[PDB]
Design an enzyme around this catalytic site. Structure first.
Site, short mmCIF file in Angstrom:
data_model
loop_
_atom_site.label_atom_id
_atom_site.label_comp_id
_atom_site.label_asym_id
_atom_site.label_seq_id
_atom_site.Cartn_x
_atom_site.Cartn_y
_atom_site.Cartn_z
N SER A 181 39.39 31.57 34.82
CA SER A 181 38.38 30.70 35.47
C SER A 181 37.11 31.50 35.78
O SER A 181 36.01 30.94 35.60
CB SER A 181 38.94 30.04 36.71
OG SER A 181 39.66 28.86 36.38
N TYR B 299 33.91 31.76 33.45
CA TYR B 299 33.00 30.59 33.40
C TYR B 299 31.88 30.73 34.44
O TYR B 299 30.88 29.99 34.30
CB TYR B 299 33.80 29.29 33.53
CG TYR B 299 34.65 29.03 32.32
CD1 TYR B 299 34.10 28.49 31.17
CD2 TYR B 299 35.99 29.40 32.28
CE1 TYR B 299 34.86 28.28 30.03
CE2 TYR B 299 36.76 29.19 31.15
CZ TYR B 299 36.20 28.63 30.02
OH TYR B 299 36.94 28.42 28.90
N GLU C 221 45.76 26.58 30.20
CA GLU C 221 44.70 25.63 30.63
C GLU C 221 45.38 24.33 31.07
O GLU C 221 46.38 23.95 30.42
CB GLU C 221 43.71 25.36 29.49
CG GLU C 221 43.08 26.62 28.90
CD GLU C 221 42.04 26.38 27.82
OE1 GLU C 221 41.87 25.21 27.41
OE2 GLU C 221 41.40 27.36 27.38
C1 LIG Z 1 25.19 17.34 33.96
C2 LIG Z 1 26.45 17.61 34.74
O1 LIG Z 1 26.38 18.42 35.65
N1 LIG Z 1 27.65 17.00 34.50
C3 LIG Z 1 27.89 16.00 33.44
C4 LIG Z 1 28.97 16.56 32.49
C5 LIG Z 1 30.21 16.97 33.29
C6 LIG Z 1 29.84 17.98 34.37
C7 LIG Z 1 31.09 18.37 35.13
O2 LIG Z 1 31.32 17.81 36.18
N2 LIG Z 1 31.96 19.30 34.66
C8 LIG Z 1 33.17 19.65 35.42
C9 LIG Z 1 34.37 19.32 34.54
N3 LIG Z 1 34.26 20.06 33.26
C10 LIG Z 1 35.30 20.84 32.86
O3 LIG Z 1 36.28 20.92 33.58
C11 LIG Z 1 35.36 21.66 31.64
C12 LIG Z 1 34.81 21.45 30.42
C13 LIG Z 1 35.20 22.60 29.60
C14 LIG Z 1 34.96 22.98 28.27
C15 LIG Z 1 35.50 24.16 27.80
C16 LIG Z 1 36.27 24.97 28.62
C17 LIG Z 1 36.52 24.61 29.94
C18 LIG Z 1 37.36 25.46 30.81
C19 LIG Z 1 38.58 25.92 30.31
C20 LIG Z 1 39.41 26.71 31.08
C21 LIG Z 1 39.05 27.05 32.37
C22 LIG Z 1 37.83 26.60 32.89
C23 LIG Z 1 36.99 25.80 32.11
C24 LIG Z 1 35.79 25.50 32.98
N4 LIG Z 1 36.02 26.16 34.26
C25 LIG Z 1 37.20 26.80 34.21
O4 LIG Z 1 37.68 27.44 35.12
C26 LIG Z 1 35.98 23.41 30.43
O5 LIG Z 1 36.05 22.81 31.62
C27 LIG Z 1 33.00 19.87 32.50
C28 LIG Z 1 31.77 20.04 33.40
C29 LIG Z 1 28.83 17.33 35.32
#
Ligand SMILES: CC(=O)N1CCC[C@H](C(=O)N2CCN(C(=O)c3cc4cccc(-c5cccc6c5C=NC6=O)c4o3)CC2)C1
Length: 235
Positions: A130, A133, A214
């Site tokens: 995490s 990121y 994940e």
């Molecule tokens: C404009 C705007 O602000 N927003 C509209 C678009 C959505 C935005 C939002 O609310 N989001 C929150 C939820 N999210 C994810 O959860 C997401 C996506 C994604 C892709 C690859 C990899 C990861 C990953 C994979 C392992 C671990 C971790 C993540 C990430 N954080 C991690 O710790 C990912 O996570 C997408 C963004 C708000």
């Protein structure tokens, strides 16, 4: 002519927004309180960080957060089984919108790649995953990571990238199986929520793309954020 908030919460707000501190705190509609570093809560949370290291992290501050009516939203899924406290890491810039409007799912229309379990909300059981990121440099080596109570229920367990439209009948979440996992036998209960704070071990899952587990949910109501951590990255 002063802010009534605790000093760590004030430093936290000035961080997020990069105009009066109190006014910016009200914009979040989130009750941010500082967990006592001596408390049982802080000890378990600080143990979850150190055990799930596979870039060394010191826990500066632990905040107990509660976004407006996220309880109500999540109530239906508070009944579900397999509720795990899991990591979500994001850029410091995003935390103004996150605490404001919660974790959301990007729309199918919006172009997206690198997503390997479709458009949902992803989480890690290992902190070092995490943490990546946060995208913190030596120039500004403080990053923010959330702990969220994720209602996973029946997990649809995959070990290869698959763009998810709908879940198989009876499945509530997806879990990518990584090469490394927390020790299953060192799992404990915090508020009836499984905290996988065992040390990184070989999972036994061989033919897998993933290095780390994940967790993905495709409904925002399945998430209920509990803690926000301010972390110093030691290079
Ligand atoms: C404009 C705007 O602000 N927003 C509209 C678009 C959505 C935005 C939002 O609310 N989001 C929150 C939820 N999210 C994810 O959860 C997401 C996506 C994604 C892709 C690859 C990899 C990861 C990953 C994979 C392992 C671990 C971790 C993540 C990430 N954080 C991690 O710790 C990912 O996570 C997408 C963004 C708000």
């Amino acid at each position: 002519t002063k802010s009534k908030l605790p000093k760590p919460v004030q430093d936290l707000i000035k961080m997020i927004f990069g105009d009066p501190i109190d006014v910016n705190y009200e914009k979040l509609k989130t009750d941010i309180k500082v967990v006592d570093r001596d408390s049982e809560e802080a000890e378990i949370i600080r143990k979850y960080v150190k055990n799930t290291h596979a870039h060394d992290l010191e826990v500066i501050d632990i905040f107990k957060i509660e976004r407006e009516g996220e309880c109500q939203r999540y109530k239906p899924f508070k009944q579900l089984h397999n509720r795990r406290l899991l990591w979500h890491g994001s850029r410091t810039t995003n935390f103004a919108g996150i605490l404001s409007q919660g974790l959301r799912i990007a729309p199918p229309e919006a172009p997206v790649t690198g997503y390997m379990f479709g458009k949902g909300i992803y989480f890690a059981d290992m902190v070092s995953k995490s943490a990546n990121y946060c995208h913190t440099s030596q120039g500004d080596p403080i990053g923010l990571i959330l702990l969220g109570e994720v209602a996973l229920g029946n997990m649809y367990e995959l070990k290869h990238a698959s763009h998810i439209s709908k879940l198989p009948k009876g499945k509530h979440s997806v879990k990518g199986l990584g090469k490394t996992t927390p020790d299953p036998s060192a799992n404990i209960s915090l508020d009836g929520v499984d905290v996988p704070l065992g040390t990184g071990i070989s999972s036994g899952v061989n033919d897998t793309s993933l290095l780390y587990n994940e967790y993905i949910v495709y409904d925002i109501a399945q998430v209920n954020l509990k803690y926000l951590l301010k972390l110093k990255f030691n290079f």
